[PDB]
Design a protein around this motif. Structure first.
Motif, PDB file in Angstrom:
ATOM      1  N   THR A 131     -35.815  99.044  -5.429  1.00  0.00           N
ATOM      2  CA  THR A 131     -35.797  98.787  -6.864  1.00  0.00           C
ATOM      3  C   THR A 131     -36.408  97.402  -7.191  1.00  0.00           C
ATOM      4  OG1 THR A 131     -33.647  97.747  -6.864  1.00  0.00           O
ATOM      5  CG2 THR A 131     -33.673 100.164  -7.131  1.00  0.00           C
ATOM      6  N   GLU A 132     -36.590  97.131  -8.480  1.00  0.00           N
ATOM      7  CA  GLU A 132     -37.247  95.902  -8.956  1.00  0.00           C
ATOM      8  C   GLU A 132     -36.475  94.625  -8.571  1.00  0.00           C
ATOM      9  OE1 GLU A 132     -36.439  98.556 -10.727  1.00  0.00           O
ATOM     10  OE2 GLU A 132     -38.275  99.407 -11.625  1.00  0.00           O
ATOM     11  N   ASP A 133     -35.172  94.747  -8.309  1.00  0.00           N
ATOM     12  CA  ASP A 133     -34.338  93.607  -7.908  1.00  0.00           C
ATOM     13  C   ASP A 133     -34.544  93.226  -6.445  1.00  0.00           C
ATOM     14  OD1 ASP A 133     -32.785  93.063 -10.338  1.00  0.00           O
ATOM     15  OD2 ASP A 133     -31.609  94.854  -9.842  1.00  0.00           O
ATOM     16  N   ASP A 134     -34.970  94.186  -5.627  1.00  0.00           N
ATOM     17  CA  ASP A 134     -35.084  94.004  -4.178  1.00  0.00           C
ATOM     18  C   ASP A 134     -36.534  93.795  -3.729  1.00  0.00           C
ATOM     19  OD1 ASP A 134     -32.330  94.727  -3.929  1.00  0.00           O
ATOM     20  OD2 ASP A 134     -32.969  96.884  -3.873  1.00  0.00           O
ATOM     21  N   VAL A 135     -37.503  94.226  -4.527  1.00  0.00           N
ATOM     22  CA  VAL A 135     -38.910  94.132  -4.144  1.00  0.00           C
ATOM     23  C   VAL A 135     -39.487  92.839  -4.725  1.00  0.00           C
ATOM     24  CG1 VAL A 135     -41.199  95.187  -4.461  1.00  0.00           C
ATOM     25  CG2 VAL A 135     -39.155  96.606  -4.023  1.00  0.00           C
ATOM     26  N   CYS A 136     -40.237  92.117  -3.899  1.00  0.00           N
ATOM     27  CA  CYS A 136     -40.802  90.831  -4.290  1.00  0.00           C
ATOM     28  C   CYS A 136     -42.315  90.842  -4.327  1.00  0.00           C
ATOM     29  CB  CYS A 136     -40.326  89.723  -3.342  1.00  0.00           C
ATOM     30  SG  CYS A 136     -38.562  89.390  -3.514  1.00  0.00           S
ATOM     31  N   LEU A 137     -42.862  90.017  -5.196  1.00  0.00           N
ATOM     32  CA  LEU A 137     -44.292  89.833  -5.281  1.00  0.00           C
ATOM     33  C   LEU A 137     -44.750  89.351  -3.911  1.00  0.00           C
ATOM     34  CD1 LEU A 137     -46.936  89.608  -6.924  1.00  0.00           C
ATOM     35  CD2 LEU A 137     -46.083  87.280  -7.559  1.00  0.00           C
ATOM     36  N   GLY A 138     -45.790  89.974  -3.380  1.00  0.00           N
ATOM     37  CA  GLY A 138     -46.318  89.588  -2.086  1.00  0.00           C
ATOM     38  C   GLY A 138     -45.724  90.298  -0.894  1.00  0.00           C
ATOM     39  N   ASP A 139     -44.642  91.063  -1.084  1.00  0.00           N
ATOM     40  CA  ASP A 139     -44.058  91.839   0.014  1.00  0.00           C
ATOM     41  C   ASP A 139     -45.148  92.724   0.585  1.00  0.00           C
ATOM     42  OD1 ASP A 139     -41.400  90.924  -0.539  1.00  0.00           O
ATOM     43  OD2 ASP A 139     -40.712  92.872  -1.247  1.00  0.00           O
ATOM     44  N   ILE A 140     -45.212  92.778   1.912  1.00  0.00           N
ATOM     45  CA  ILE A 140     -46.095  93.689   2.617  1.00  0.00           C
ATOM     46  C   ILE A 140     -45.278  94.767   3.312  1.00  0.00           C
ATOM     47  CG2 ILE A 140     -47.875  93.882   4.401  1.00  0.00           C
ATOM     48  CD1 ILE A 140     -48.687  90.946   3.761  1.00  0.00           C
ATOM     49  N   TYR A 141     -45.672  96.022   3.104  1.00  0.00           N
ATOM     50  CA  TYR A 141     -44.963  97.171   3.703  1.00  0.00           C
ATOM     51  C   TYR A 141     -45.945  97.996   4.536  1.00  0.00           C
ATOM     52  CZ  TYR A 141     -41.286  96.198   0.282  1.00  0.00           C
ATOM     53  OH  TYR A 141     -40.330  95.559  -0.489  1.00  0.00           O
ATOM     54  N   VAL A 142     -45.455  98.543   5.644  1.00  0.00           N
ATOM     55  CA  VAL A 142     -46.189  99.579   6.362  1.00  0.00           C
ATOM     56  C   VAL A 142     -45.748 100.905   5.749  1.00  0.00           C
ATOM     57  CG1 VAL A 142     -46.612 100.775   8.533  1.00  0.00           C
ATOM     58  CG2 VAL A 142     -46.454  98.335   8.542  1.00  0.00           C
ATOM     59  N   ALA A 143     -46.709 101.761   5.451  1.00  0.00           N
ATOM     60  CA  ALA A 143     -46.441 103.102   4.976  1.00  0.00           C
ATOM     61  C   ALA A 143     -47.377 104.041   5.675  1.00  0.00           C
ATOM     62  CB  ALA A 143     -46.667 103.181   3.452  1.00  0.00           C
ATOM     63  N   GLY A 144     -46.855 104.904   6.547  1.00  0.00           N
ATOM     64  CA  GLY A 144     -47.743 105.729   7.372  1.00  0.00           C
ATOM     65  C   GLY A 144     -48.609 104.840   8.245  1.00  0.00           C
ATOM     66  N   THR A 145     -49.914 105.111   8.293  1.00  0.00           N
ATOM     67  CA  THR A 145     -50.862 104.239   8.970  1.00  0.00           C
ATOM     68  C   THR A 145     -51.455 103.148   8.016  1.00  0.00           C
ATOM     69  OG1 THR A 145     -52.685 105.817   8.586  1.00  0.00           O
ATOM     70  CG2 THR A 145     -51.360 106.096  10.601  1.00  0.00           C
ATOM     71  N   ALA A 146     -50.956 103.065   6.790  1.00  0.00           N
ATOM     72  CA  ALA A 146     -51.458 102.101   5.798  1.00  0.00           C
ATOM     73  C   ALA A 146     -50.610 100.807   5.712  1.00  0.00           C
ATOM     74  CB  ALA A 146     -51.542 102.781   4.393  1.00  0.00           C
ATOM     75  N   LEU A 147     -51.204  99.738   5.174  1.00  0.00           N
ATOM     76  CA  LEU A 147     -50.482  98.498   4.839  1.00  0.00           C
ATOM     77  C   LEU A 147     -50.728  98.192   3.382  1.00  0.00           C
ATOM     78  CD1 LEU A 147     -51.272  95.811   7.537  1.00  0.00           C
ATOM     79  CD2 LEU A 147     -48.962  96.126   6.478  1.00  0.00           C
ATOM     80  N   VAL A 148     -49.647  97.930   2.665  1.00  0.00           N
ATOM     81  CA  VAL A 148     -49.699  97.706   1.232  1.00  0.00           C
ATOM     82  C   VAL A 148     -48.917  96.446   0.849  1.00  0.00           C
ATOM     83  CG1 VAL A 148     -50.110 100.141   0.672  1.00  0.00           C
ATOM     84  CG2 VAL A 148     -47.729  99.261   0.780  1.00  0.00           C
ATOM     85  N   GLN A 149     -49.301  95.847  -0.277  1.00  0.00           N
ATOM     86  CA  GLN A 149     -48.699  94.608  -0.750  1.00  0.00           C
ATOM     87  C   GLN A 149     -48.406  94.730  -2.231  1.00  0.00           C
ATOM     88  OE1 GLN A 149     -51.101  90.869  -1.051  1.00  0.00           O
ATOM     89  NE2 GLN A 149     -49.432  89.871   0.099  1.00  0.00           N
ATOM     90  N   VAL A 150     -47.219  94.277  -2.626  1.00  0.00           N
ATOM     91  CA  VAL A 150     -46.815  94.253  -4.044  1.00  0.00           C
ATOM     92  C   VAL A 150     -47.650  93.236  -4.795  1.00  0.00           C
ATOM     93  CG1 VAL A 150     -44.873  93.871  -5.669  1.00  0.00           C
ATOM     94  CG2 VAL A 150     -44.451  94.975  -3.444  1.00  0.00           C
ATOM     95  N   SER A 151     -48.235  93.671  -5.901  1.00  0.00           N
ATOM     96  CA  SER A 151     -49.192  92.871  -6.677  1.00  0.00           C
ATOM     97  C   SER A 151     -48.755  92.471  -8.080  1.00  0.00           C
ATOM     98  CB  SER A 151     -50.496  93.644  -6.812  1.00  0.00           C
ATOM     99  OG  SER A 151     -50.322  94.858  -7.514  1.00  0.00           O
TER     100      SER A 151
END
Length: 195
Positions: free
Chosen positions: A78-98
């Motif tokens: 949720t929006e309370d736990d996710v931070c700007l700049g967090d990087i997550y692995v999802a499947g074979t992808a890497l994503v970052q909160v923008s």
């Protein structure tokens, strides 16, 4: 129990002005490629499924995966736990909160609920976008694994709060605008304000 519970895909359309993707997206049951592509910053729109419970209670009708036009319906983030700049692995992808996702009129038209964008801004139940750091492939049910906490640990809830309510908080805005992971457009807005 942090995952993509649903990957939702929409149909492309042309407008006379360009190609845009529709707010109507349908859950799919197969692997989906995660590509890089303003466009880059908003590559993947994500929405917490938890909030569907609240919307069903507020409006007396169902809200299931795809209801907010999201590419990725999430569980455990949720929006309370996710931070700007967090990087997550999802499947074979890497994503970052923008950035946070802003409520919009397409969503109001989808549900025929004119007060829905205001409600999103009032509750902070907005969801958020990711940029794609490394392209890959994901499947429905894919875990989303935090591999790096965004520097400063600035939550999407905090950032929405500054943006919608503390428009005259200089120190707060400069700090968020200073974050290297912030989408260019949000940076600009915090720099137009502040001047």
């Amino acid at each position: 129990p942090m995952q993509i519970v649903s990957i939702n895909v929409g149909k492309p359309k042309t407008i006379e002005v360009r190609l845009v993707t529709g707010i109507d997206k349908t859950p799919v049951a197969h692997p989906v490629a995660v590509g890089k592509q303003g466009g880059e910053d908003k590559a993947i729109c994500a929405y917490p499924s938890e909030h569907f419970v609240y919307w069903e209670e507020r409006y007396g009708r169902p809200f299931t995966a795809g209801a907010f036009g999201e590419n990725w319906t999430l569980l455990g983030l949720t929006e309370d736990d996710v931070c700007l700049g967090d990087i997550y692995v999802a499947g074979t992808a890497l994503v970052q909160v923008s950035q946070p996702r802003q409520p919009c009129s397409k969503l109001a038209f989808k549900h025929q609920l004119p007060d829905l964008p205001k409600a999103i801004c009032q509750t902070g139940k907005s969801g958020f976008y990711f940029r794609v750091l490394q392209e890959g492939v994901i499947e429905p049910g894919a875990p989303l694994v935090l591999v790096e906490r965004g520097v400063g640990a600035l939550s999407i809830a905090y950032i929405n709060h500054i943006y919608y309510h503390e428009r005259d908080n200089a120190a707060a805005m400069k700090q968020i605008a200073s974050h290297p992971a912030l989408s260019a457009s949000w940076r600009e807005t915090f720099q137009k304000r502040l001047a």
